[PDB]
Amino acid sequence: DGSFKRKASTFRRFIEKGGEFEPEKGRYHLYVAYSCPWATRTLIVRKIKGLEEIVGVTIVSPLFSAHGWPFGDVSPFPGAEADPFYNAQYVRDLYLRADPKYEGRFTVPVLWDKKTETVVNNESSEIIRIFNTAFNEFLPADKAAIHLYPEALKSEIDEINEWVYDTVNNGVYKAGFATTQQAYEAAVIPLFESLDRLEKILTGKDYLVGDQLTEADVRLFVTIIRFDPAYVGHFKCNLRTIRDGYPAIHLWLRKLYWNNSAFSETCKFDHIKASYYAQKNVNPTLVVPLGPIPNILPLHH
Amino acid sequence: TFRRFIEKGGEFEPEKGRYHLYVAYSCPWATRTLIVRKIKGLEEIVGVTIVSPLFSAHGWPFGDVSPFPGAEADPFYNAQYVRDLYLRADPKYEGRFTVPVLWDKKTETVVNNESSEIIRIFNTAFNEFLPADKAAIHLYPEALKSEIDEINEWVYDTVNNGVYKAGFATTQQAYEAAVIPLFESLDRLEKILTGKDYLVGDQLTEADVRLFVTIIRFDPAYVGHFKCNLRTIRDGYPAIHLWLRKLYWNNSAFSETCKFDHIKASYYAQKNVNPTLVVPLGPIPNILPLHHH
């Protein structure tokens, strides 16, 4: 075969009044890696909705090991942190604390409940939607009104998300984790056709849907911001680059990054590059290339 | 120790149909001799055999051993690998079994296996068999020799060898120690070539040939596989990029000897660097058209 098949996330609970997980301040905690785009989704939205003092965060080490994601005391790296709560050493320890029999993959992001010591949700697409409303009572009326998945734009967001996820978000992994030439080509060609499609959508536009920030932008951003700095080279996604092959995408990308601090402050290029290029099965030398220079070009304005 | 020349009255007299080049399209050193062979119109005077680009544990295989489009069988000795030629010439030879090999079919020996000396031989050794315009061509003429040597020195050390020093580095430190001077030399070349068509003397010389074989492989192979990715030629060095496209598109000697499929297959089958053996489909195209902005 040789093709990459992503497994689904199995912690799919929400935070709702009267439910198992009541909205509370200081109760829920996000375990993430700065390198993981899926995890970065939740960080971006945490800052967009102003949840920084309502939902906590721990940064695991970018240096994925044989035991998974280590905490910062186990595999030090600038900005990587120790687990504040269970003296955990690997993200795995969190999962097996929630369920010693759990047999899924030990992925970030983890939206964690400190009260019952379990995983509420480990599906990035649901965590950012939780963040749209679940904590609105702890927010000012205007910050609470922020909603990245609004009803009036829902279907259009869903329609773009479906193929962006399949051929772009996951497409880069299907290309880079392919182990045959046939599997590699079957992923990378649709990837770049989807980029051609996105380029037309974004021509003369600042946002994918409705001329305003939505989760479709967030979800696409975490892949594209990583494209030139890592996916082009390490994952062989190199038919062309964003900065020189897709001017509309490139402009959209630079405006998100440079004009909206939620996108730039959660973007750590050293974590990103260290993580991908430490994958032995793809890059045995473990060398991290010094390029591209820069990680993202200025807006020029 | 195979560093002999072709001169009248010498061990290897200039003769037609006597001398033969064994090369791989993927190797830039070997490609030097292919480019100069066509610049000097030597195609029907000096023969060529294209070995397989799929380098093996036994070295360069011939095309019957490791088939690949355009790779050929050895026409003369049923050789399987390039080493067999070397050991035909001298069973005790203990050097590297490199291409290019400039081979003497008469006495069955290696005349020369140094690409820098082969392309110089080609400047004059066969001029008696050529039309006047091809015979007058000289890529290392006396009046530019010192200038060609000066640029060759650091091009060879930090660019020709440099992409290999970076790409074959096994530590972060060695890698950076190689790639940084590489791109500083490219910055230097960018200045030299701003508003110029040739590195030296406003005319084609071996300096252009020697730089071309590295740069033509830069975006299609060295950027990704050898991590020479601070910036690309096509987007980072417009002067180099123009010089390059003029050589390729205006001079058939540069383009007809350029087989990007051989180049990419050869680099990306290096198991120690790219264990998956996948060959990227990009960049698209391998070299942009001449009238592109």
Chain B residues with CB-CB distance to A184 below 8 A: 278, 280-281
Please name which of A76, A77, A73 lies closest in space to residue A93, comparing C-alpha atoms.
Answer: A73
**Contact criterion met (CB below 8 Å) for B236 and B243:** no
In which residue are the tokens 């630079």 written? A254
Q: Do A285 and B180 touch (CB under 8 A)?
A: no
The CA-based angle B181-B34-B67, given to 5 degrees, is 100
Nearest to A195 by CA among A224, A217, A175, A170: A224
Give the dihedral sign, CA A51/A52/A56/A59.
positive
Which residue shows structure tokens 């350029």?
Answer: B258
Closest alpha carbon to A225 in A188, A256, A247, A198: A256
CA distances in angstroms from A10 to A59, A122, B11, listed in the order given? 22, 7, 78
> What would you measure as the largest C-alpha separation in chain B, in angstroms?
54
Integer Cα distance of A237 and A187 in angstroms: 9
Which residue in B156, B271, B263 sits closest to B220, CA to CA? Answer: B263
Interatomic CA distance for residues A128 and A135, integer angstroms? 12
Residue B146 half-sphere exposure toward CB, CA atoms < 13 A: 1
First-to-final CA distance of chain B: 47
| Containing structural domain, residue B160 | 142-269
Mutate to test the interface with B, among A172, A234, A238, A243 (most CBs of B within 10 A): A238
Q: Determine which one of B6, B21, B23, B27 is catalytic.
A: B27
Report the DSSP beta bridge partners of residue B158: none
Closest Cα in chain A to B286: A239
Partner-chain residue, chosen from B176, B232, B280, that has the shortest CB–CB distance to A236: B280
For chain B, state the CA radius of gyration: 19
Top residue of A184, A192, A236 to mutate, by most chain B CBs within 10 Å, is A236
Angle between helices B238-250 and B206-215 in degrees, nearest 10: 110
Structural contact between residues B115 and B123, judged by C-beta atoms closer than 8 angstroms = no
DSSP string, B224-265: HHT---SS-HHHH-HHHHHHHHHHHHH-HHHHTT--HHHHHH
Residues of A in contact with B179 (CB under 8 A): 289-290
The dihedral of CA B72, B75, B79, B82: what is its sign?
A: negative
- Chain A residues with beta carbon closer than 8 angstroms to that of B230: 290-293
Query: A111 forms bridges with which residues in the sheet?
Result: A30, A121
Closest-CA distance, A260 to chain B, in angstroms, reads: 27
Q: Can you read off the two tokens belonging to residue B60?
A: 């360069």
Cis link prior to A294 (omega < 30° from 0)?
Answer: yes
For B282, other C-beta atoms within 10 Å of its C-beta total: 21
Contact B273 A281 (CB under 8 A): no
Q: What angle do CA B177, B179, B184 make, to 5 degrees?
A: 100
Cβ neighbours around B188 below 10 Å, total:
15
Nearest to B282 among A240, A287, A289 (CB): A240
Contacts of A185 in chain B (CB under 8 A): 281
Shortest CA distance from B229: residue in chain A: A291
β-strands B19-23, B47-50: how paired?
parallel
Instruction: Kindly report the CATH number assigned to the domain that includes residue B172.
Output: 1.20.1050.10
Angstrom distance (rounded) from CA A35 to CA A279: 12
Q: Is B180 strand, coil or helix?
A: helix
CB B201 within 8 A of CB B144: yes
Sheet holding A56-59, edge to edge: A56-59, A28-32, A110-113, A118-121
Q: Are residues B253 and B210 in contact, defined by beta-carbon separation less than 8 angstroms?
A: no
Q: Please state, in angstroms and as integers, the Cα–Cα distance from residue B131 to each residue in A1, B72, B135, following that order.
A: 57, 29, 6
Q: Say if A155 is an interface residue toward chain B (CB within 8 Å).
A: no
Q: Which of A240, A277, A287 to mutate to test the interface with B (most CBs of B within 10 A)?
A: A287
Measure Cα distances from A299 to A133, A296, B111, B204 in Å.
Answer: 32, 9, 58, 40
d(CA B242, CA B292): 9
Q: How many CB pairs under 8 A join A and B?
A: 86
DSSP classification of residue B98: P
**Residue A214, amino acid:** T
Q: How was this structure obtained?
A: X-ray
Reported as type and span, the H/E element at residue A63 is none
| B-chain residues near A291 (CB < 8 A) | 227-231
Is A290's CB within 8 Å of B231's CB? no
* Nearest residue to A148 (alpha-carbon basis) of A162, A130, A135: A130
> Which stretch of DSSP H or E encloses residue A126?
helix A124-133
Q: Does B240 touch chain A (CB under 8 A)?
A: no
Residue A212 DSSP one-character state: S
3-state secondary structure of A125: helix
Question: Around Cβ B70, how many Cβ atoms within 10 Å?
Answer: 12
**Closest residue of A to B285, CA-based?**
A239
Question: With contact defined as beta carbons under 8 Å apart, do A296 and A225 qualify?
Answer: yes
Residues of A in contact with B264 (CB under 8 A): none
Closest residue by Cα to residue A32 from A43, A16, A47, A45? A43
Nearest to B213 by CA among B83, B119, B98: B119
Q: Do B230 and A185 touch (CB under 8 A)?
A: no
The two structure tokens encoding residue B26: 């993927």
Strand ranges inside chain A, DSSP E: 28-32, 56-59, 110-113, 118-121
Cβ–Cβ < 8 Å for A28, A56: yes
Q: Which residues pair with A217 in a beta bridge?
A: none
Give the single-character DSSP code of A285.
Answer: T
Question: What 8-state DSSP symbol labels residue A152?
Answer: G
